Short mmCIF file of C-alpha atoms and ligand atoms in Angstrom, two decimals:
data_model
loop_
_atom_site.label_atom_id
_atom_site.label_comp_id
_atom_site.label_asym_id
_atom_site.label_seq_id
_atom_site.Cartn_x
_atom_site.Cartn_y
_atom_site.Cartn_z
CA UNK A 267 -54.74 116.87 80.05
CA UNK A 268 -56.94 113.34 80.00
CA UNK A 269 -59.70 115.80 77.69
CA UNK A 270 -57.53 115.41 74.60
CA UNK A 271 -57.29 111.62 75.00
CA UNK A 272 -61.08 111.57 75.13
CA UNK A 273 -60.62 113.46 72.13
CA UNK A 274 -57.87 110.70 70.54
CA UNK A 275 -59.79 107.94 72.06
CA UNK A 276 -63.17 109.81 69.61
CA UNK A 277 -60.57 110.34 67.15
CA UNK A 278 -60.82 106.15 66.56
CA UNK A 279 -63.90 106.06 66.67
CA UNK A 280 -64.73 108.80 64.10
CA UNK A 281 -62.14 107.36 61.91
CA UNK A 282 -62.41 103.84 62.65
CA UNK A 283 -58.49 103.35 62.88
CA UNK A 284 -55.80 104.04 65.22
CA UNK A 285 -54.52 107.02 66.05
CA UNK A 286 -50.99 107.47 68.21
CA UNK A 287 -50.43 110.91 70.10
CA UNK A 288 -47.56 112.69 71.39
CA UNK A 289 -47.32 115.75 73.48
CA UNK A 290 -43.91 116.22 74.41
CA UNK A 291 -42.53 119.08 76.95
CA UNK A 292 -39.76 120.49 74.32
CA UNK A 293 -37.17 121.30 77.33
CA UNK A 294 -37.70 118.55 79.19
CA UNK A 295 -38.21 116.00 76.42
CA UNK A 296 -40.81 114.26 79.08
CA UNK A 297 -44.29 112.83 77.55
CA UNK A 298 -46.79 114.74 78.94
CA UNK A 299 -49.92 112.80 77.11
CA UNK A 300 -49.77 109.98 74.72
CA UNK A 301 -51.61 106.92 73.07
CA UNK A 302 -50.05 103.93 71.51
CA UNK A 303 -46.77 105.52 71.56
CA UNK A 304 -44.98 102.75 70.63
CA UNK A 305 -47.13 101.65 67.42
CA UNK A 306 -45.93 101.93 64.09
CA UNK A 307 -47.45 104.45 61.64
CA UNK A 308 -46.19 105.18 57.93
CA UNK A 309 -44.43 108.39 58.20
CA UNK A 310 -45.81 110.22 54.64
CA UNK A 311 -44.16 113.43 53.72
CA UNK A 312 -43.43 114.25 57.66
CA UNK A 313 -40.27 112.28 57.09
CA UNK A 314 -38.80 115.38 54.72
CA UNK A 315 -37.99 117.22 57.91
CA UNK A 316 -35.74 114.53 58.94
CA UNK A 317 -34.32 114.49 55.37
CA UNK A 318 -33.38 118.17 55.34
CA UNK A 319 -31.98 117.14 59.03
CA UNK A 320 -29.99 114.91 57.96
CA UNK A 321 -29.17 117.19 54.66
CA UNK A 322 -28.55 120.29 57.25
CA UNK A 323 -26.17 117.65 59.46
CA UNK A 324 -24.06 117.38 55.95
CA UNK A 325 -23.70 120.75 55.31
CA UNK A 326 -22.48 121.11 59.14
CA UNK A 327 -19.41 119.21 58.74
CA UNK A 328 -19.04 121.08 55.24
CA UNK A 329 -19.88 118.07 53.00
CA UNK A 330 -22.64 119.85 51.51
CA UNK A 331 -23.90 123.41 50.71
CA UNK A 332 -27.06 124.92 50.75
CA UNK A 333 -26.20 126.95 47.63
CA UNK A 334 -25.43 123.81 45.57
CA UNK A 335 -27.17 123.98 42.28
CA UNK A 336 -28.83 120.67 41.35
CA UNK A 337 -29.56 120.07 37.68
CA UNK A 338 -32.17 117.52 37.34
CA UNK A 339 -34.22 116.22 34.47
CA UNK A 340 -37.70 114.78 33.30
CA UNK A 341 -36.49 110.92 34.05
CA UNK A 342 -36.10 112.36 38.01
CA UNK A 343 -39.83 113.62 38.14
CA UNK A 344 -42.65 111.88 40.19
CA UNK A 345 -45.91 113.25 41.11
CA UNK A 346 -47.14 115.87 42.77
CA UNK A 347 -43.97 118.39 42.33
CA UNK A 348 -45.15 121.37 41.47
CA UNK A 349 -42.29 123.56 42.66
CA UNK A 350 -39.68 120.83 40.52
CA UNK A 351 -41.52 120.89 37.89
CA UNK A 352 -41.64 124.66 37.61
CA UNK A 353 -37.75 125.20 37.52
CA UNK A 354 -36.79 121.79 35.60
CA UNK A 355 -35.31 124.38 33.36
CA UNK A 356 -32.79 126.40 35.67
CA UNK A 357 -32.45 123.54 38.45
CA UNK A 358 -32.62 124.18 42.12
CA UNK A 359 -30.45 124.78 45.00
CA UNK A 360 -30.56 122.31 47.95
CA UNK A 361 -31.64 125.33 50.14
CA UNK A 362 -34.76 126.05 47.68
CA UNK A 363 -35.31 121.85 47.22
CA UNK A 364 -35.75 121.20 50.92
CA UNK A 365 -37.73 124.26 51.06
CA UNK A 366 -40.05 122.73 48.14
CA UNK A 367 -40.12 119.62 50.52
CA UNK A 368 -41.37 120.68 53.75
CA UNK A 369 -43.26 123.62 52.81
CA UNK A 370 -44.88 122.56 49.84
CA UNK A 371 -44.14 118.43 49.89
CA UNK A 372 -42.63 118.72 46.51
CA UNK A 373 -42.22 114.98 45.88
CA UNK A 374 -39.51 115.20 43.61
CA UNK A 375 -37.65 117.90 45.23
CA UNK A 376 -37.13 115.33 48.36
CA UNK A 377 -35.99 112.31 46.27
CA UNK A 378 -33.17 114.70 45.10
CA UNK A 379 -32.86 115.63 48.12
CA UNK A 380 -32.40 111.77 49.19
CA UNK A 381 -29.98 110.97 46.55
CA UNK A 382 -27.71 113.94 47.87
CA UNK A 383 -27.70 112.06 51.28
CA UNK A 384 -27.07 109.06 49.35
CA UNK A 385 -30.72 107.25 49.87
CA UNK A 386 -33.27 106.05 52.32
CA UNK A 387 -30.43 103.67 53.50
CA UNK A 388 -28.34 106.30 54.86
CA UNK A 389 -31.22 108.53 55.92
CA UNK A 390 -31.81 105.61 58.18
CA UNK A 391 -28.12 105.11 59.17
CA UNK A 392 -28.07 108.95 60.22
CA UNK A 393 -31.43 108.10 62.69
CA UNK A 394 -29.88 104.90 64.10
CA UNK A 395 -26.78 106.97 65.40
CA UNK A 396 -28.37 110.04 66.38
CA UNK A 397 -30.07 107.54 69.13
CA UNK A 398 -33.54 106.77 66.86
CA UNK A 399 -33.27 102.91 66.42
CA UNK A 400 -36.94 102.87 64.98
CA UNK A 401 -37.73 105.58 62.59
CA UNK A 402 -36.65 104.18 58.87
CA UNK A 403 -36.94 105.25 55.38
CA UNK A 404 -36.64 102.13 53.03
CA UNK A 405 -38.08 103.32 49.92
CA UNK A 406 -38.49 106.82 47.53
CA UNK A 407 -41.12 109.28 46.72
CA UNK A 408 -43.85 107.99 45.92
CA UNK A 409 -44.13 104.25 47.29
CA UNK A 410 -42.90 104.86 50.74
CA UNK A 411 -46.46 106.22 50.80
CA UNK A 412 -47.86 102.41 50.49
CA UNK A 413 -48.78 102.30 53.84
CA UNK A 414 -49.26 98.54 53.37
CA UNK A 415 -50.93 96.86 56.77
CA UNK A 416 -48.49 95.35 58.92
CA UNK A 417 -45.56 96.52 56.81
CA UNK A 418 -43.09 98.41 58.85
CA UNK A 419 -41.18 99.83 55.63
CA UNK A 420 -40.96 103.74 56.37
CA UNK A 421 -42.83 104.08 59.64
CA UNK A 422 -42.46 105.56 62.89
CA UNK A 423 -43.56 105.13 66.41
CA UNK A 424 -45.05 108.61 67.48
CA UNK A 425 -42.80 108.51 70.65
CA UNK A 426 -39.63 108.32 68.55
CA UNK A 427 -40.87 110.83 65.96
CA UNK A 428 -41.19 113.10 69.06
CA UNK A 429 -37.89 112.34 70.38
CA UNK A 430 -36.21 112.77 67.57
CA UNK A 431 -37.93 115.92 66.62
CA UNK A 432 -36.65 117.55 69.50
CA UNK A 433 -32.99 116.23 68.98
CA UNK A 434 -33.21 117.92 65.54
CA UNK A 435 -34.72 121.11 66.80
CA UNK A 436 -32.99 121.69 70.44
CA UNK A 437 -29.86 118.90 70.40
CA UNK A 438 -26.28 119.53 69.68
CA UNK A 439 -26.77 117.10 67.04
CA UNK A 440 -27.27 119.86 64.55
CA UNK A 441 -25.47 123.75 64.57
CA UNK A 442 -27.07 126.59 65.96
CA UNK A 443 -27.87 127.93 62.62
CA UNK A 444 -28.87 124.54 61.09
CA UNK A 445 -31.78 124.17 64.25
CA UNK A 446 -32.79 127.75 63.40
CA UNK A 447 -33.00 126.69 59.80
CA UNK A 448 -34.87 123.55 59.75
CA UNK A 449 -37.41 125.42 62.21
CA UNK A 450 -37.84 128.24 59.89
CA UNK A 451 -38.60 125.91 56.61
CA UNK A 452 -41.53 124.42 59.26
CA UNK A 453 -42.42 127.53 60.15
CA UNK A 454 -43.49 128.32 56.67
CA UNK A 455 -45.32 125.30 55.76
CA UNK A 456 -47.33 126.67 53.41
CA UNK A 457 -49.44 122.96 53.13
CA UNK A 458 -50.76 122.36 56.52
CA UNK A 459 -53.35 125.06 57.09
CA UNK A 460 -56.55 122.16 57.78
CA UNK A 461 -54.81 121.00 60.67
CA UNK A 462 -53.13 122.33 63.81
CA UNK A 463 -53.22 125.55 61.98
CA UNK A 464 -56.55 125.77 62.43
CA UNK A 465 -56.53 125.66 65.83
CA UNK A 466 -53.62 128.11 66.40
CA UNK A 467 -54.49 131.07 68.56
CA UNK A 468 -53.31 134.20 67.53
CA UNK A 469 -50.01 134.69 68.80
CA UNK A 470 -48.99 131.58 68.80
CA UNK A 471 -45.68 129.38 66.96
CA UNK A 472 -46.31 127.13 65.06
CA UNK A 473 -43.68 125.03 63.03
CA UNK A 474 -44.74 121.82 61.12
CA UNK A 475 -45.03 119.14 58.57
CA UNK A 476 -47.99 116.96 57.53
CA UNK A 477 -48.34 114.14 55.38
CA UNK A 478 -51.05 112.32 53.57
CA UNK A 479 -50.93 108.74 52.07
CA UNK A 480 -52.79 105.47 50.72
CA UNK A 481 -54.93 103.59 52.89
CA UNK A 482 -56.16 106.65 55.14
CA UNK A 483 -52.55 107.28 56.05
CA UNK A 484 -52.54 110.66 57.46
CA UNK A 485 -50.28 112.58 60.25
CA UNK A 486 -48.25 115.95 61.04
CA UNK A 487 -45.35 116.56 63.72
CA UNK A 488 -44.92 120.10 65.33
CA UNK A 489 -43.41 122.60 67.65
CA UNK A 490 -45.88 124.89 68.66
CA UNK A 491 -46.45 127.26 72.00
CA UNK A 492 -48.11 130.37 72.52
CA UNK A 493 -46.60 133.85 72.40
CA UNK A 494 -44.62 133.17 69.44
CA UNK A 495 -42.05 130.64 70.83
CA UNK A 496 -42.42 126.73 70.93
CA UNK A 497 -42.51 125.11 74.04
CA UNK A 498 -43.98 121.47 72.98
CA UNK A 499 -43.73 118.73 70.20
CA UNK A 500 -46.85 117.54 69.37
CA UNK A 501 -46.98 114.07 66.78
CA UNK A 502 -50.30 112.73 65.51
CA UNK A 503 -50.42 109.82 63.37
CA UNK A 504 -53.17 107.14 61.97
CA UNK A 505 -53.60 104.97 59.02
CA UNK A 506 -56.22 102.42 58.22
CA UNK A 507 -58.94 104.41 58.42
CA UNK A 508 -61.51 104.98 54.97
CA UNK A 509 -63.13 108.47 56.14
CA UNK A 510 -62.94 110.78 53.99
CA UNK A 511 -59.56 113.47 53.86
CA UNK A 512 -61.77 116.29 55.38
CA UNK A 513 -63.08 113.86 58.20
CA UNK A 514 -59.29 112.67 58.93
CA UNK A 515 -58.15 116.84 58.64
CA UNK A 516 -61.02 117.54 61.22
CA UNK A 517 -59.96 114.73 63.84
CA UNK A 518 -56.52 116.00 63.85
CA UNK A 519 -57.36 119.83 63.79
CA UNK A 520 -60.38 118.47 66.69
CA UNK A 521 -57.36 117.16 68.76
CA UNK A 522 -55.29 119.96 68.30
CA UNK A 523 -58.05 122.45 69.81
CA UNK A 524 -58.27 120.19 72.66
CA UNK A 525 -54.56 120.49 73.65
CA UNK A 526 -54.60 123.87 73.09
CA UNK A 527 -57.60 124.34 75.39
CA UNK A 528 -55.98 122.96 78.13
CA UNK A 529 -52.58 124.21 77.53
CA UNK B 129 -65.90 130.69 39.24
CA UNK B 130 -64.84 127.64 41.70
CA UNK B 131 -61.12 126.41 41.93
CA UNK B 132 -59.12 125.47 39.29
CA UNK B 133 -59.95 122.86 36.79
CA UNK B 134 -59.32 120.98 33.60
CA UNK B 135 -61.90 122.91 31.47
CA UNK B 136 -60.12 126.15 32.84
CA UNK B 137 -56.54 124.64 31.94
CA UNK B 138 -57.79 123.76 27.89
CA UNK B 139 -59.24 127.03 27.80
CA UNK B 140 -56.22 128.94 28.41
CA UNK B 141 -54.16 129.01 25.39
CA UNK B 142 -50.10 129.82 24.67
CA UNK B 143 -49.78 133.14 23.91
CA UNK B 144 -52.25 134.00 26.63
CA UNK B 145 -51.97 137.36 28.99
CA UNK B 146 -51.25 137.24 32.78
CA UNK B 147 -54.83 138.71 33.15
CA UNK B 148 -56.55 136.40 30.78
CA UNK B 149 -55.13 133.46 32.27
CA UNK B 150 -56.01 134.93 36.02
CA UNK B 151 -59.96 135.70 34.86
CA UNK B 152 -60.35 132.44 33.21
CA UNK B 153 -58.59 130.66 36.14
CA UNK B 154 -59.97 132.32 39.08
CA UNK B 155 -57.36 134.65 40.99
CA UNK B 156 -58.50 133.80 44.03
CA UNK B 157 -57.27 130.07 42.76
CA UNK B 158 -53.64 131.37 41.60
CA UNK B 159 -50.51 133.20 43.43
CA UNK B 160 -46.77 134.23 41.67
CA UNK B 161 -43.73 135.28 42.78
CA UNK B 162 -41.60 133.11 45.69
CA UNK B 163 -40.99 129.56 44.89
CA UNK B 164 -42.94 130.10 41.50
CA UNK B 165 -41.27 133.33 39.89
CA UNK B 166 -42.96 134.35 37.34
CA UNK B 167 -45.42 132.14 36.59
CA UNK B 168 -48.69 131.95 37.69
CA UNK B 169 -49.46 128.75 39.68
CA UNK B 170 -53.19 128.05 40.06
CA UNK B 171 -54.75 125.39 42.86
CA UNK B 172 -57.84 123.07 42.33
CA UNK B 173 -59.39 120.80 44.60
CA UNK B 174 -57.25 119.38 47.23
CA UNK B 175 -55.33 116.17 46.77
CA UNK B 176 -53.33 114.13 49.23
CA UNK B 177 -50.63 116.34 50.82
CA UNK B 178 -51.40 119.40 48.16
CA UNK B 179 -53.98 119.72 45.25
CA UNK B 180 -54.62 118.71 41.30
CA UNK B 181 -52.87 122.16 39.85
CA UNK B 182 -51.99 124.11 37.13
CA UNK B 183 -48.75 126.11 36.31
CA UNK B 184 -48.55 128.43 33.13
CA UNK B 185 -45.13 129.85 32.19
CA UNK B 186 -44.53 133.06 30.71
CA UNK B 187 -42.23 134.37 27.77
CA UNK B 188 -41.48 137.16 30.70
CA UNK B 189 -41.70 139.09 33.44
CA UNK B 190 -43.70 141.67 31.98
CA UNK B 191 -47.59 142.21 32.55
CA UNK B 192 -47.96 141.93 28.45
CA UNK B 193 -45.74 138.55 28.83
CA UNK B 194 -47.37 135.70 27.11
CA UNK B 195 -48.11 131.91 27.96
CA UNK B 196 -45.49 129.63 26.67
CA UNK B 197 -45.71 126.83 29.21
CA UNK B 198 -48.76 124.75 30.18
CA UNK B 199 -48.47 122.51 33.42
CA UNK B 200 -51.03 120.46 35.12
CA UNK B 201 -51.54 117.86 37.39
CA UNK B 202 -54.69 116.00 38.36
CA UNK B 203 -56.77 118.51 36.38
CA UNK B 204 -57.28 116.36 33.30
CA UNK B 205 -58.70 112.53 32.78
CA UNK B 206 -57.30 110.47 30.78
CA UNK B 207 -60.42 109.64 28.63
CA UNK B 208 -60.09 105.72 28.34
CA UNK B 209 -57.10 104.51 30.06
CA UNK B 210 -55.63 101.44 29.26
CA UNK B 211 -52.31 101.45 29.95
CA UNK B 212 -50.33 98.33 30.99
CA UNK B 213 -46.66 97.52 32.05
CA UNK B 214 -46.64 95.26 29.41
CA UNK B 215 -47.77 98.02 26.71
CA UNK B 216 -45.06 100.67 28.53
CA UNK B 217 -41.92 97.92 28.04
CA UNK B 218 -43.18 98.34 24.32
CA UNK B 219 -42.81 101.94 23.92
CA UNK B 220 -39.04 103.15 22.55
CA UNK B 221 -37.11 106.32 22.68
CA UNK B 222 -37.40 107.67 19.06
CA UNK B 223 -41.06 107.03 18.19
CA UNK B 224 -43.22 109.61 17.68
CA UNK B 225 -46.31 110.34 19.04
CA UNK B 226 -48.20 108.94 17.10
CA UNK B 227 -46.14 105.93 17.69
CA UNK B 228 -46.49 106.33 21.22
CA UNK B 229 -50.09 106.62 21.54
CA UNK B 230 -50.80 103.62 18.97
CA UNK B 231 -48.31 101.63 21.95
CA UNK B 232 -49.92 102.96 24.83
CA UNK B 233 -53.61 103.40 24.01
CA UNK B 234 -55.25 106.52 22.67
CA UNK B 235 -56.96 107.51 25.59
CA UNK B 236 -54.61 106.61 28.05
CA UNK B 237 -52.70 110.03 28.51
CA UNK B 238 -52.96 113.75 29.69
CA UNK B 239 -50.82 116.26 28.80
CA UNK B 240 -48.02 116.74 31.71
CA UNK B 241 -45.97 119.87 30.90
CA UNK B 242 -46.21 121.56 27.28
CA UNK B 243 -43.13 124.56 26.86
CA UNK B 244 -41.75 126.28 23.74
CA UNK B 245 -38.84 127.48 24.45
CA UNK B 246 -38.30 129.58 21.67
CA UNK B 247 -41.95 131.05 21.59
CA UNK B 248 -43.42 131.84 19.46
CA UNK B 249 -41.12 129.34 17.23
CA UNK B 250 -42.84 125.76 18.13
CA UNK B 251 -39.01 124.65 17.56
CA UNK B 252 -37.75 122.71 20.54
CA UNK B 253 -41.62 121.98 22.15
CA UNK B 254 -40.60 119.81 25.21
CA UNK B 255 -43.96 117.61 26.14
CA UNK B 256 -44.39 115.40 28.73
CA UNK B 257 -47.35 113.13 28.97
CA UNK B 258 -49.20 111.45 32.28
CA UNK B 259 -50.48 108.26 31.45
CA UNK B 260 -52.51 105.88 33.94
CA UNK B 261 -53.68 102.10 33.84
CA UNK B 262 -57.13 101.18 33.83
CA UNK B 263 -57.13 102.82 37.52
CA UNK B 264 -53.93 104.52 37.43
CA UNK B 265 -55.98 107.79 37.36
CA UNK B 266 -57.15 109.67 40.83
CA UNK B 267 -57.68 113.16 41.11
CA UNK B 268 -57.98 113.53 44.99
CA UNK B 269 -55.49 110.66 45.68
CA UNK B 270 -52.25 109.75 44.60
CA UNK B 271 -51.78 108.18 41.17
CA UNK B 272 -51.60 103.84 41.03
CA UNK B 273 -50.36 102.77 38.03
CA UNK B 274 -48.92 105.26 35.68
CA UNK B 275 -45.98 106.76 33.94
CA UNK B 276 -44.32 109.59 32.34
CA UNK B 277 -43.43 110.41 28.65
CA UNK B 278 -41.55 113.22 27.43
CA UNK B 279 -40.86 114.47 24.35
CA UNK B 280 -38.52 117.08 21.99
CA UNK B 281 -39.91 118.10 19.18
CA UNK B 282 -42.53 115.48 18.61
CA UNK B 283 -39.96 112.58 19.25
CA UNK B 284 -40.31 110.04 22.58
CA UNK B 285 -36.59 111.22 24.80
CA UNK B 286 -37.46 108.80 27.66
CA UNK B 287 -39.90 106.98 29.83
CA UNK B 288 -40.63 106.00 33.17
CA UNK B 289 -43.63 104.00 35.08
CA UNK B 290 -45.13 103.37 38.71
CA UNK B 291 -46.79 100.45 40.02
CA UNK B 292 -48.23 99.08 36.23
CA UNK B 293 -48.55 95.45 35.94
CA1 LIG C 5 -51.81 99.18 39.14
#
């Protein structure tokens, strides 16, 4: 509905940056709103869902399993882990480390899980053949947060974020199970509550991942719809802009209500 | 009593009780259980993606269990940082420290993660230190010039930076 692009369009404004906006029809895969789909935005932590993806993809075709303990130590530990942190002792499965990552953007748990994929290189390699020839991952927790103007180093357009969300969610690129599975862990985001959340009607699905980083760099991807089931991917991205974290949380969770409202 | 914070995080002491730890903290502030077992994992103000934090470990399960792990992040300032890349190349596995702190300034670090693992023997203490540049430090954002120093039993094991120059 042209509403929430008045909304995006105020979003700018507001923030004094761009924003780019998806709203994507999740069995059709058609666009149903957007703005500047085709721009670049640094992904953040939204990029762990296409990690455990990828991760999920692995365990598929039985190279990997999600009950494989992981025994890390203090030299692997980078900021803001507090799950990590908590069992450096004991380790952690790759189930409970890419459940650290999306619900709780456990830093360290998804450089782990990166190095069990075998790095931002191959993370990328699995997007290029899955049909994403612009989503890329080029560095680890926590620089690929830079968000350097200009630099395309692990960014996104929000149009292939969207498409590939939904290849990861409803393809045949993944196993029944493995859809179900990366769905649930977004389901339970446990980090994400200032934004779409906070717009969610009662009733409704909601499965997501946000991300925050340097230079105003803030964003989430979702699969929401009412009556407990998804029925659209919604991507919202911007970076540049120096308002403060609550402003940037409000201008997302403002756009969210609008979409909703015309739903 | 607000959301977590660093004064809350020195008060609380090892040895510590579930409930002293929760009415010094704030329970409203802390949760258990799930991806956090039996400790008790307490939230401050928000901070990029989650928020500055504070995780105490217990000896046990039990509600008489005692603290025997400190962890925080973002909660405590470094009170004059001056760490460099130049001074972090110059720290060693094997000093002390004392050693350490003489290398990378004495107000340069926080304290990480503090466990004895043989509670309420200080044998074994694993600590881990957070130390920023002159603007490494940021308790809402993301930290931007810093590293990580941990430590058995009073002795440097390893090191690692971000970003110092
Ligand atoms: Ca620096």
């Amino acid at each position: 509905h042209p509403e929430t692009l008045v909304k995006v369009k105020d979003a700018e404004d507001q923030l004094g940056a761009r924003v780019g906006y998806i709203e994507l029809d999740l069995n059709s895969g058609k666009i149903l709103e957007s703005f500047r789909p085709e721009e670049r935005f640094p992904m953040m932590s939204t990029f762990k869902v296409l990690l455990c993806g990828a991760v999920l993809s692995r365990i598929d075709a039985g190279q990997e399993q999600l009950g494989r303990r992981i025994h890390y130590s203090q030299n692997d530990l980078v900021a803001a882990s507090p799950v990590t942190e908590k069992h450096l002792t004991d380790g952690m499965t790759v189930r409970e480390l890419c459940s650290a990552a999306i619900t709780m953007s456990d830093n360290t748990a998804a450089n782990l899980l990166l190095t069990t994929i075998g790095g931002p290189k191959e993370l990328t390699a699995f997007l290029h053949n899955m049909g994403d020839h612009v989503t890329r991952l080029d560095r680890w927790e926590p620089e690929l947060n830079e968000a350097i103007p200009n630099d395309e180093r692990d960014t996104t357009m929000p149009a292939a974020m969207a498409t590939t969300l939904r290849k990861l969610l409803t393809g045949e690129l993944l196993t029944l199970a493995s859809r179900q599975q990366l769905i649930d862990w977004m389901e339970a985001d446990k980090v994400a509550g200032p934004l779409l959340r906070s717009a969610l009607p009662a009733g409704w699905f909601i499965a997501d991942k946000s991300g925050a980083g340097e230079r105003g760099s803030r964003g989430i991807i979702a699969a929401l719809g009412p009556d407990g089931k998804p029925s659209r991917i919604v991507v919202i991205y911007t970076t540049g802009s120096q308002a403060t974290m609550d402003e940037r949380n409000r201008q997302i969770a403002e756009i969210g209500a609008s979409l909703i409202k015309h739903w | 009593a607000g959301v977590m914070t660093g004064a809350k995080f020195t008060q609380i002491q090892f040895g510590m009780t579930r409930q002293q730890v929760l009415d010094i903290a704030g329970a409203e502030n802390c949760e258990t259980g799930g991806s956090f077992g039996d400790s008790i994992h307490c939230r401050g103000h928000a901070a990029g993606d989650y928020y500055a934090y504070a995780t105490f470990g217990f000896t046990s399960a039990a509600a008489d269990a005692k603290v025997d792990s400190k962890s925080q992040e973002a909660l405590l300032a470094p009170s004059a940082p001056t760490l460099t890349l130049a001074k972090f190349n110059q720290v060693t596995v094997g000093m002390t420290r004392a050693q350490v702190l003489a290398t990378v300034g004495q107000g340069s670090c926080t304290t990480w993660s503090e466990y004895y693992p043989a509670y309420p023997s200080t044998a074994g203490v694993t600590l881990s230190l957070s130390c920023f540049d002159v603007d490494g430090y940021s308790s809402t954002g993301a930290a931007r010039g810093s590293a990580h120093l941990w430590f058995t039993d009073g002795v440097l094991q390893g090191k690692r930076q971000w970003d110092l120059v």
